[PDB]
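Researcher: For the annotation table, I need structure tokens for Prostaglandin-H2 D-isomerase. Please keep the output clean. Sequence:
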Amino acid sequence: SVQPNFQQDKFLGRWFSAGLASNSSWLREKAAALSMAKSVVAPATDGGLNLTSTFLRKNQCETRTMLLQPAGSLGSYSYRSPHWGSTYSVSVVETDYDQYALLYSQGSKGPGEDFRMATLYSRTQTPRAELKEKFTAFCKAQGFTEDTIVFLPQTDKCM
């Protein structure tokens, strides 16, 4: 399930990781104990995307980069994780490009095959009420119970 007629160039740039829902209790715990700064979506070679996440961990600014390769329909990507020895599909399910994107990720190969995550990307660091509701409803249609949805703490300290 992808955004119809997905335009990758319009998806680029600065986003904020504003909420998530996952079936990993470990991941929800870690994320909520962090403060999120901007994410940057940039082009990689062969039509890929470089996703760079910045966050505050013990008042230290840190960054992680993920290489996403196009895979399947326009708007869908695959991510090979060295650390988890697994591959994950990541799809932009719904975006208006200018305000929000709803992402859905799940394992496709390896031990992480069962992993599932919904992500709210927002162009603003604090998403409006209606955007928060849109994300919660999306999480529920993806089969996440309400207590597995987390709106992530944000910081302006790594900008």
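Researcher: And a one-line annotation?
Model: The chain is about 15% helix and 45% strand.
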